[PDB]
Amino acid sequence: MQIFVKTLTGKTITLEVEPSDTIENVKAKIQDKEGIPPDQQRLIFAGKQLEDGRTLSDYNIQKESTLHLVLRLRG
Amino acid sequence: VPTCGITTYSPPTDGSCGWHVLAAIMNRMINGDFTSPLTQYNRPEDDWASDYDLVQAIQCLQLPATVVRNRACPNAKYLIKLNGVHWEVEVRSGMAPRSLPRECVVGVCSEGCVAPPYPADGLPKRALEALASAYRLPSDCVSSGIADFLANPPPQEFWTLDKM
Ligand SMILES: [Zn+2]
């Protein structure tokens, strides 16, 4: 299925994924499309901050869904 | 009334800057003093606070605050920013606080985002106390600490002295 990922600059990436795919998989795909290291990626879905362990299924991310890509900040 | 210029709180360089930022937001809300009343607490890189930690904490304490990524949420009274590696916070003085949606808090909201007025009795009573009880935990646990406190708060006025 297709999902969309929106960067902070308002770019829209289109990904091919399965509901089974883990958040880590999605990050790896984003890297392949954008050259953003997973190390510094955080994915948001309707405000809910996604976590590496879980799948798209677990977060209810279906076809056509839009995620927001955010840069990890530590201070 | 329209105002100009930027009003910023920069925490000390103790290693707890993010938590000081939240503390200061609440300290201004409650007492008009835009600064941290938390006692300084030293820690290294591996106990720094993330945008994840700060977002969770903002939601627990129910603050009119966003973490600014790129666009600042127009409805956020308090703007949290990572300045290099130092968490700082700006405040919009001439503006009533607004209760922010989650996307607004996280700072991934879109042009047109809406938020209703923050209720006067809107800051959880003992929010600042909850943060004070929690902040010296590992940063990835601080929000859990706050949530636990607020959910089941110690009722005794001098509970800290009791616990000693
Ligand atoms: Zn917003």
Numbering used by the authors:
A (entry chain B): 1 to 75
B (entry chain A): 413 to 576
Text lifted from the article:
PRRSV replication is accomplished with the help of four virus-encoded proteases–one of which is the papain-like protease 2 (PLP2), located within nsp2, which processes the nsp2|3 cleavage site to release nsp2 from the rest of the viral polyprotein. Subsequent work demonstrated that several arterivirus OTU domain proteases hydrolyze ubiquitin (Ub) thereby downregulating Ub-dependent cellular innate immune signaling pathways as means to evade host antiviral mechanisms. To this end, we determined the crystal structure of the PRRSV PLP2 domain both in the presence and absence of its Ub substrate to a resolution of 2.85Å and 2.3Å, respectively. Overall, PLP2 adopts a similar, compact OTU-like fold similar to that of the previously determined EAV PLP2 domain, comprising of α and β lobes, as well as a structural 4-cysteine zinc finger, and a DALI search indicates the PRRSV PLP2 domain most closely resembles that of EAV PLP2.
To determine the residues involved in Ub recognition by the PRRSV PLP2 domain, we were able to determine a crystal structure of the PLP2 domain of PRRSV strain DV bound to Ub. Formation of the PLP2-Ub complex was facilitated by modifying the C-terminus of Ub with a reactive probe that forms a covalent adduct with the active site cystine of the PLP2 domain. The PLP2-Ub complex crystallized in space group C2221 with 3 copies of the complex in the asymmetric unit. Ub binding appears to be mediated primarily by V518 and V520, which interact with the hydrophobic I44 patch formed by Ub residues L8, I44, H68 and V70. Additional salt bridge interactions are found between PLP2 residue D463 and Ub residue R42, and a hydrogen bond between the backbone carbonyl of Ub residue L8 and the sidechain of PLP2 residue N482. Direct interactions between Ub, and a PLP2 loop structure comprised of residues 453–460 (453 loop) are also observed, with Ub residue Arg74 forming an H-bond with the backbone carbonyl of PLP2 E457. A comparison of the PRRSV PLP2-Ub complex with the EAV PLP2-Ub complex shows that that Ub binds in a slightly different orientation, with the PRRSV PLP2-bound Ub tilted further towards the α-helical lobe of PLP2. This shift in substrate orientation is mediated by a PLP2 loop formed by residues 480–484 (480 loop), which is shifted roughly 7.4 Å toward the Ub-binding interface with respect to the homologous EAV PLP2 structure, and which would otherwise clash sterically with Ub. A comparison of the apo and Ub-bound PRRSV PLP2 structures shows that Ub-binding results in a repositioning of H498 in a catalytically competent conformation, although there is no obvious direct coordination by nearby residues. Stabilization of the β3-β4 loop is mediated by hydrophobic interactions between W499 and L494 of PLP2 and L73 of Ub.
